[PDB]
């Protein structure tokens, strides 16, 4: 819903940019100005989309959706608060001004005579008011619905200032365009649309254009011979006093906060003071320590995605089985327990860690078996053999939920199970946090049964039983298949297990990364290779 | 991975803010400056996290994850491009400067004598160079590894300028702090870290502090009686020429782009030109039309979430069944075909549209039946009765996939099926786009069989068969149950159907919004109410 503000922002910026485009060109090539009132069109643009112009068993499913509603609830409140704050600021200036008004004085006759001498050539609509003051240092103007020009008494006391003629024309020019009226109106709208900062940008740009037009007016009424004189009188405006800006709703003559002005102030100021070295020393020390503190927690880099970079403790043989894989790009690893040697296809791919998917069920079962979640006489949660054999997640998810995460972690760590990351979900092995390479599963499965003596003996073979694929006179082939599928595409096909033969004990894993990397294909591929390698021939 | 830049930004802004904090205070209360070199600490802070300081059947599942990797791929390229652009800009200025250097002239004797007269009181390390120029309008300085002060020949021609003493001290002061060295260094770092705009903010702030210190130095060497004179000589710097800023890598004396300066230029410029009205007229016209154009597509508001706001065409009776619902907050609607009257519990809740979930299977079956996706002799995709009866989504998802979306839409529209929105997914009825209220399902189911004669007769009763819950001597109760569950919480329990009795024909729906809003509960609740209402009593 807050997206509506976003839509409004886009509209605003569109119109905003178009106007800026023209402004540049017209000035750049023709020295032309725009009637700034066009900026009201942007405020209007900002409210386009904002206006609603439309012109028997139970079945259930557990869904996940992005909750962006809590965001809008919060954003709504923020918008409200910003408006409240801004209202105050507006008011602050406004109040000052009404109090200021009350302190003004009627202008007397001789001064009036001088003023008329200055403006009689306009014969204007004398529905504006000119007053003097014993307070303010320099002339100002504001609206009140009265259109007031207020001049410090010092400039009448300066009976022969001459320059009065210039300041008067300047003030006249602003009054003429009711700048002080539009400013208020504009600001009110801006206050409400607190969510779009471009409004402040426009607010500010307008002011420069206003002053430029005032200068042109004034010059139009000045004998050019005196333009220099005039310019000098302008410079004088920043030499005597600090600039002031409390009354954001009004117009002053001393120009604005600027580098030049700050410097001029600094020259006048008796600034010849010194400070102890400690000021910088300590700021620097603490700043440093604070960086140190941040560091204690902050770190990151792509290196955290590292796969099985580690060398084997023994010998391995490279093998090519690409005619077998065909389009099913992948890797293959086999290990001989008697030779203490690995046989590897695509040694680069074999090191890449992928979620184990269904082949994690192998380890999951070992863990469930040791913890008596499931056991060798009764493995029911469905049972182990059935669930492994018929692809039942209901069962394995239940085993996982009931294995203390620390037990799982203990064994994932003892066996070097890839990144040993079990995440937080009961289904952590499927396109999720726990990842392992094809080479690692061969290493890991082997250790699970042959080197790691923590596991009960029964857990080791109860698991093998659930994995039997085939048995014959030469060997018994065990393993599990499955596939990680993301957005309907099969991306991670696995077949993991072991072969005990009449000649040796083998561990293996097959992984498919592309083409049609199904579990079934990983199995078929593994079998063809294992047969070619003698594993499934009894050779 | 790009998140790393984000981490860097946070670090940067932390240190940045701390420094700004102190700067304000030290100046505000003690009038103290900082050795700006501390800003290098922020550049260092910006690289904290950046440094990698780490100190048997196949089972498969179809997963969805957020792809933020394409984003990083793109962001990487953008970063590279920004650096390329900035490199050019840097170079542009740099080249200008080397060419400029070559045009400088050695300073002669009398001028040297004057210069030494000015600086003999420093007896400085004369390893810097002073030259004059016949090109530039005002004195400048730069680095080159030479530390050069270059003064236009006009200021030596102005043999009695006097003010030379001031300009020289100013230049000396910048040379002293090697401002021109640090600027380059800083900028180079900034160019690489193109992703964090705060670097530009720092770049700019530094310059003001540099100029302030230069002024202090200069004043320290001036008889205070002349401070006024000095200040006047500063103002003169912006009266004669335009300011220039091509050489961003260097320091000039005419101050900077500013409102005052633009105005002074405008005074000198013969700007008394006029323009045709058409300039604004057409910009305004087109701007308007463009807003019109945007509008043709842009609209939004919360009103699009409207539920079943519409009154019935007949009479309805309010009923309270809150003792039945108990904690299972919900609604209940029943309709009498003979009386043409509705009986409603929680008439507000009954109008709220929710995804129909499994009860959509009712309509889905009608559609599948008419289209011969499934039929009355063979409804297999599992069959209709089984799938309805045993909660099989596999089956219904297949029916949905095979119903032309326009056919479904035709009937959703003829029956006023809530918002009639079937989205885009084969499972659009489950915690998804198609939504309908409890009151609407009663209306809609009724029309499906009693008013809408598009549907085949066989589709109407083939569906009823799959829905039979109970049959007896007084009535046959039909319907379907199910639940929308989100993030494990049951949020939308439904029971929808009809009762044909020995006295009348009833349509009904029960919906549960909170507590334990299961499908089963909606059924139990409906049955208790329907019995109390006489529907399931044959009364
Ligand atoms: Zn003004
Ligand atoms: Zn300077």
Author numbering:
A (entry chain B), B (entry chain A): 1 to 55, 87 to 412, 428 to 585
Describing publication, verbatim:
BlaR1 and MecR1 are membrane proteins with an N-terminal zinc metalloprotease domain and a C-terminal extracellular β-lactam-binding sensor domain. β-Lactam binding to the extracellular BlaR1 sensor domain regulates BlaI cleavage by the zinc metalloprotease domain in the cytoplasm. BlaR1 forms a domain-swapped dimer, with the zinc metalloprotease active site accessible from the cytoplasm. BlaR1 undergoes spontaneous autocleavage in cis between Ser283 and Phe284 and we describe the catalytic mechanism and specificity underlying the self and BlaI cleavage.
More structural heterogeneity was detected in the BlaR1(WT) dataset compared with the uncleavable mutant BlaR1(F284A), suggesting enhanced dynamic motions. In the BlaR1(WT) dataset, the sensor domains were observed to be dynamic and are able to adopt different orientations with respect to each other and the transmembrane domains. A comparison with BlaR1(F284A) shows that the sensor domains are positioned at different distances to the transmembrane domain in order of BlaR1(WT), BlaR1(F284A) and BlaR1(F284A)–ampicillin. Although a range of states exists in all of the samples, the equilibrium is shifted—BlaR1(WT) is dominated by a more extended conformation and the BlaR1(F284A)–ampicillin structure is more compact, with the sensor directly in contact with the outer leaflet of the membrane. In the BlaR1(F284A) mutant structures, the autocleavage loop is intact; however, in the BlaR1(WT) structure, we detected a mixture of uncleaved and cleaved forms, the latter with the central P1′ Phe284 slightly shifted in position. Here, BlaR1(WT) undergoes spontaneous autocleavage, consistent with previous reports. In all of the structures, the protease domain is in an autoinhibited state with the autocleavage loop (both cleaved and uncleaved) occupying the active site, suggesting an equilibrium between active site occupied/autoinhibited and active site accessible states.
